[PDB]
Design a protein around this ligand. Structure first.
Ligand SMILES: Cc1cc2nc3c(=O)[nH]c(=O)nc-3n(C[C@H](O)[C@H](O)[C@H](O)COP(=O)(O)O)c2cc1C
Ligand SMILES: Cc1cc2nc3c(=O)[nH]c(=O)nc-3n(C[C@H](O)[C@H](O)[C@H](O)COP(=O)(O)O)c2cc1C
Ligand SMILES: [Mn+2]
Ligand SMILES: [Mn+2]
Ligand SMILES: [Mn+2]
Ligand SMILES: [Mn+2]
Lengths: 128, 282, 282, 128
């Protein structure tokens, strides 16, 4: 299973529609909180800009500070843009360093055809 | 009416306003002087190319400052949209000003002025400048946003290839730092203008979106073909021509994704040498 | 559209003002506004309503300068370097407008802010003022726009700017005053520069046309002056401070005229400011 | 005698045209240097903005650091704008504190009618 967040720009959203795999979306509305009952890989876009810790979106932090969802986290994939230098996919290693889970993949915006390809093959071989 | 930042319609305006404003920088804050010993080791061909690249980028950034961003202002959805566009406009001047900072520190005036004259004479550069300006003066707000996203998220990178290349060789590393600040701005610029293009797509009919999709890909390929010619005339005396073209295809796909479209160029056309991608993101 | 060369300056003032305005960069987040909360709590209801109505008024006029004012001056630039400075001016007008929202956010209750906004919408003197200014911006004469701009921010704004300067001398809302001093520091350079270019533009028109514009400016000044007396009377109606505000208006009117190259019109009696106000300014 | 500098905006120039008193101008062209053979009060505009020393114009420094002109300097009058806070007339007290000559007056832009009356009365009383 895959859990993801996407803003009103919906870049990561369109990545998962083109991916094909069944996934659950972390609500854009901050009041509504969603709960997961099975082990998952988290796909999160970066919004740091620099190094002021705010790379991970607020809706994800609220999702992950919940002990139920956090314990079921198995891996993380980060999206973003290479044009942000060292901060490209910053949300990835921040979640990976804090939770202890490994940082799996790294891609840009909606993902290229090579990206979807590598995430499809990557996820299945991860579970095995 | 009086703008109210506590009555935000689209939450994305405030996020982008905060990012772009707190990203504020000036070319004076980059130590360009430390690149002079590196500049003196570059060959005559390499120096000539460097100057021709930045004089071309000076014209295009000025176009974004004077006509580009200001032509998007009357076509704004929110009042906060106009305030963000004020910032983009201003920062295009900073971008254009920073190329002059490079010439002042490194280059000679006879060589710089010759490069400016070369850019005046160059046919593909003027053709690119005319085509983009043509859409800004137009009556269609949707085509303006397409032209703006294509220019700075795709076309510029024929020039931006050079500093990143020198960076991977360990030359002009401070100049590349300056460019990475311009690149950082443009990633947000393209994202935002592309995002606002998609919000504008909501109002036009289902069939009207199909005509814009056709137009975007037509404009992309018309400019892509023109940029191949511009690349060949720039990199004429260097074996790097084919590597720049791959870097163009890689960025063209990102320009499309900013507008919410599928990437057009396949992996084997858009495969950039890892050293160039490493210079962009360490 | 030509490639800008910051190493080939036609008018030295373009570089000087560019350098000053850019290195003077600030954001409302730089000022610790939340430290004024205790001082805000000690104000009377009358003083609180007045403060909110003053800033809701100033938000309209700065938004006008952001969207219509500074953009309308751009087509009439004498140099390309002038265009880039006006791009900065435009953006900073958005920062100016944005920072008034930072004050409401930190100090005031949402219900009262909206009431103050609705008060500004209904206020006739304020709306009459804004319609006169933008009428000239939409006009066809470039020189009348430059007059209107200088009058707006080097003179008319100071009916509202008096209030935080008064609070400053009383040791109340000191951080809000620090914020306003950053805006005032911007506007001095804005008036100086636009006024300077006004005079440069007059140097290429006939002497008879110059005298026609001198008659226009003094007529427009007195028109706006008479309307601002009415605006002051409605704002400061609940206080006994109106006469002191009116004195401060005449003092800046003289400076506005001096920005354009004209002699001060208002004599000592009318332009005699309470020394505490001038002390808070310097 | 009065010595003054003014920029291409000519604010200080118009103060002296309205002053009436005989005065000599420090050339705008940096290459052209002038010499003065009599004691004088210097009228100078401020171009600081903040506190980075550069309040005194470049053409005034080249005039002043010449030993011949510096010796005959007796006092300094600054112009500017109150809107610059603490930096109002910064060029005045920078020349004053360095050269040891007193700082006499402080006026804005072209100077008010009050300023002209204050400077006329001030200059005559200074030589007394
Ligand atoms: C304000 C802002 C900050 C961003 N910061 C980063 C960043 O630090 N690193 C990165 O790789 N991408 C960054 N991005 C790019 C986004 O990660 C990218 O556009 C992503 O596709 C957004 O996904 P979404 O549309 O699902 O929210 C930023 C974008 C914005 C608008
Ligand atoms: C870039 C710039 C910086 C300035 N800095 C100061 C200052 O630090 N203190 C001050 O009192 N006035 C300052 N001013 C205002 C000028 O001193 C004022 O406009 C003066 O009248 C100009 O005279 P001039 O036209 O003869 O050059 C500054 C003006 C500019 C354009
Ligand atoms: Mn740019
Ligand atoms: Mn841009
Ligand atoms: Mn303003
Ligand atoms: Mn202004």
């Amino acid at each position: 299973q895959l859990v993801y967040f996407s803003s009103s720009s919906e870049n990561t959203q369109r990545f998962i529609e083109r991916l094909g795999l069944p996934a659950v979306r972390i609500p854009l509305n901050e009041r509504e909180r969603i709960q997961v009952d099975e082990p998952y890989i988290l796909i999160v876009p970066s919004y740091g800009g620099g190094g002021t810790a705010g790379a991970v979106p607020r809706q994800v932090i609220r999702f992950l500070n919940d002990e139920h969802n956090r314990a079921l986290l198995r891996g993380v994939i980060a999206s973003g843009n290479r044009n942000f230098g060292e901060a490209y996919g910053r949300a990835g290693d921040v979640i990976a360093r804090k939770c202890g889970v490994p940082w799996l993949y790294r891609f840009e915006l909606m993902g290229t055809q090579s990206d979807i390809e590598n995430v499809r093959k990557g996820v299945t071989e991860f579970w095995q | 009416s009086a703008i109210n930042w506590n009555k935000i319609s689209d939450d994305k305006d405030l996020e982008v306003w905060n990012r772009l404003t707190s990203n504020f920088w000036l070319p004076e804050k980059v130590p360009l002087s430390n690149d002079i010993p590196a500049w003196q080791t570059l060959t005559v061909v390499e120096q000539q190319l460097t100057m021709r690249v930045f004089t071309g980028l000076t014209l295009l950034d000025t176009l974004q400052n004077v006509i580009g961003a200001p032509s998007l202002m009357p076509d704004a959805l929110t009042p906060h949209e106009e305030a963000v566009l004020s910032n983009i406009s201003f920062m295009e001047a900073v971008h254009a000003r920073s190329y002059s900072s490079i010439f002042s520190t490194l280059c000679q005036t006879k060589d710089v002025d010759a490069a400016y004259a070369w850019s005046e004479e160059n046919a593909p550069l003027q053709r690119k400048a005319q085509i983009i300006q043509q859409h800004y003066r137009g009556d269609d707000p949707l085509k303006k946003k397409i032209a703006s996203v294509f220019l700075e998220s795709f076309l510029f990178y024929s020039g931006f290839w050079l500093p990143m290349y020198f960076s991977s060789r360990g030359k002009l590393t401070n100049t590349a730092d300056l460019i990475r600040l311009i690149i950082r701005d443009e990633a947000v610029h393209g994202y935002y203008i592309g995002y606002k293009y998609q919000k504008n797509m909501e109002k036009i009919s289902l069939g009207q979106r199909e005509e814009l999709k056709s137009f975007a890909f037509d404009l992309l390929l018309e400019l892509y073909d023109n940029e191949l010619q511009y690349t060949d005339e720039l990199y004429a005396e260097t074996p790097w021509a084919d590597d720049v073209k791959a870097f163009l295809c890689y960025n063209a796909n990102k320009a499309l994704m900013n507008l919410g479209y599928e990437p057009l160029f396949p992996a084997e056309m858009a495969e950039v040498n890892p050293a160039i991608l490493a210079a962009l993101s360490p």
